[PDB]
From Swiss-Prot:
This is Albumin. The gene is ALB. Plasma. It comes from Equus caballus (Horse). Residues 1-174, 175-367, 368-565 form the Albumin domain. One of its GO terms (biological process) is cellular response to starvation. Keywords: Allergen, Calcium, Cleavage on pair of basic residues, Copper, Disulfide bond, Lipid-binding, Metal-binding, Methylation, Phosphoprotein, Repeat, Secreted, Signal, Zinc.
Length: 572
């Protein structure tokens, strides 16, 4: 473009340009006050309009230059100021490395009266502050999807401001924010840790399941365009990302009839909704004219010639064909299946009669299928018997044993998120359980890996997190009690409760107890999951009793220590 900044300003319009520029700033500089970013947004914006009518400079150069003008940059961010000495793209790479995935910021609590009044004084300020608070908490959140979620947030406060209406809404928006963040974060982690080819393979598999009527050429086109979209978003180029995503939405809707019958609803919607709807679209019905795959991938005699000449395309075609007829499998299972297929051809094509060797290639897939089906059945059986909180506790025990070096807050977060997979997926129609469960486990394990990159503590986690992406869930599942762990010294304070727990909302009471559960496992790693449930059950009863007492602290003070000492002896 003659001037990229003006180009994007004209493509997106002023409102979304500023919005995406706000998100970008917030995610990069996570600790600056709201008002300082707004000022930088306006500066940049002013140059957009001057250029629309140094204009030659790329957005990165311009947006990175801007960032390095901020007040107190060395004091507030002692590494970022060093990034500023460097030129692009080195400089931006440097900014990205410093993005913080657990910036430890205050919980966002919906205050219906104080917030409803801010919006009235100034709606633009109020929506902008919202983009800011989520962006700095989720530095990799999918940019255009955040502007979409903010319009939902606008509809929440438009309907409910003239608490009973607003709290279950803002709580739900917040849950969709967490899931959506974890989805995008897995995309960005895949680029970073495994490269663009892993993102493509992932996308080929997922979009083939969604759009099984689409031909391979259409799937490849969409995958190529969407990988570029997410690559740009994951690299901080939010303006380009949004602009390219609107082009993709346009193409998909122009060809909705050959791509999928489920897209009709989506393509009659306004832009942001339209893109959101396509991204979340239900899978289309299986076409009746799906071809038999044995002929092209098992019975054909020139498979080795095809595999030799065009390895990436031949395999891509296998993955597209196998995935489109298997919306009942998870993406990572499909990717493990494609690896096994590739592995068969590699071995069989070296040997003397490959056709009699790769003739049974498809029967090597069936054991890959059985291991995740069993795990999903076993865990959904437990979920249904004991419910979410107790299921969460079983997983906290299971994972703390695998990785007792991991911080208690991390173990609790992950066990809680893993346990929520049961609530989401176990109730689903049964054929949708395996994909739902495993695709959502991949999100929670990625979160564990992301936290682990900055704060490494366990070589077992490093290995499962850095060996193949497709094997990550089976690697975690195969870990057992780390016997190299030295049990944590007992500290009474860790397991000592007070009456302050009583006033906490329910989810925060659970987190307190689950934190103690995690700590019990670290103290007695060999204790069975059954002994730990019993001990936690005695801690729960004690909290309930003393929170109902006339003199709560006296109750906590008297009953607290007995339960602390006796607990040690039940974990032997």
């Amino acid at each position: 473009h003659k001037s990229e900044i003006a180009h994007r300003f004209n493509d997106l319009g002023e409102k979304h340009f500023k919005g995406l520029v706000l998100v970008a700033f917030s995610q990069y500089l996570q600790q600056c006050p709201f008002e300082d970013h707004v000022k930088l947004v306006n500066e940049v914006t002013e140059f957009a309009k001057k250029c629309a009518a140094n204009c030659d400079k790329s957005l990165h150069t311009l947006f990175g230059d801007k960032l390095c003008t901020v007040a107190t940059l060395r004091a507030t961010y002692g590494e970022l100021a060093d990034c500023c000495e460097k030129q692009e793209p080195e400089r931006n790479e440097c900014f990205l490395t410093h993005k913080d995935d657990h910036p430890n910021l205050p919980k966002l609590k919906p205050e219906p009266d104080a917030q409803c009044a801010a919006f009235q004084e100034d709606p633009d300020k109020f929506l902008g502050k919202y983009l800011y608070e989520v962006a700095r908490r989720h530095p990799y959140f999918y940019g255009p999807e955040l502007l979409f979620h903010a319009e939902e947030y606008k509809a929440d406060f438009t309907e409910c401001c003239p608490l009973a209406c607003l709290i279950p809404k803002l709580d739900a928006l917040k849950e969709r924010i967490l899931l959506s963040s974890a989805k995008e974060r897995l995309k960005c982690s895949s680029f970073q840790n495994f490269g663009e080819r892993a993102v493509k393979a992932w996308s080929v598999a997922r979009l083939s399941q969604k759009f099984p009527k689409a031909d391979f050429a259409e799937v490849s086109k969409i995958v190529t365009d969407l990988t570029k979209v997410h690559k740009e978003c994951c690299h901080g180029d939010l303006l380009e990302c949004a602009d390219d995503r609107a082009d993709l939405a346009k193409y998909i809707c122009e060809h909705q009839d050959s791509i999928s019958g489920k897209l009709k609803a989506c393509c009659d919607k306004p832009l942001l909704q339209k893109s959101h709807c396509i991204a979340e679209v239900k899978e289309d019905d299986l076409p009746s004219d799906l071809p038999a795959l044995a002929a092209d991938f098992a019975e054909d005699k020139e498979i080795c010639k095809h595999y030799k000449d065009a390895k990436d395309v031949f395999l891509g075609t296998f993955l597209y064909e196998y995935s489109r007829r298997h919306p009942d499998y998870s993406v990572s299972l499909l990717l493990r299946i494609a690896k096994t297929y590739e592995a068969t051809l590699e071995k069989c094509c070296a040997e003397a009669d490959p056709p009699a060797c790769y003739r049974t290639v498809f029967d090597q897939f069936t054991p890959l299928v059985e291991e995740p089906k069993s795990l999903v059945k076993k865990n959904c059986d437990l979920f249904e018997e004991v419910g979410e909180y107790d299921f969460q506790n079983a997983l906290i025990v299971r994972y703390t044993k695998k990785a007792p070096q991991v911080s208690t807050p991390t173990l609790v977060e992950i066990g809680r998120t893993l346990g929520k997979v049961g609530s989401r997926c176990c109730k689903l129609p049964e054929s949708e359980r395996l994909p739902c469960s495993e695709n959502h486990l991949a999100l929670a394990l990625n979160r564990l890996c992301v936290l682990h990159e900055k704060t490494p503590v366990s070589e077992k986690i490093t290995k499962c997190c850095t060996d193949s992406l497709a094997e990550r869930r089976p690697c975690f599942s195969a870990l057992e009690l780390d016997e190299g762990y030295v049990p944590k010294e007992f500290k009474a304070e860790t397991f000592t409760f007070h009456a302050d727990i009583c006033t906490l909302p329910e989810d925060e009471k659970q987190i307190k107890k689950q934190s103690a559960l995690a700590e019990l496992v670290k103290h007695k790693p060999k204790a069975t999951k059954e002994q730990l449930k019993t001990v936690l059950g005695n801690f729960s009863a004690f909290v309930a009793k003393c929170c109902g007492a006339e003199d709560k602290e006296a109750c906590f003070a008297e009953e607290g220590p007995k339960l602390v000492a006796s607990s040690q002896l039940a974990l032997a």
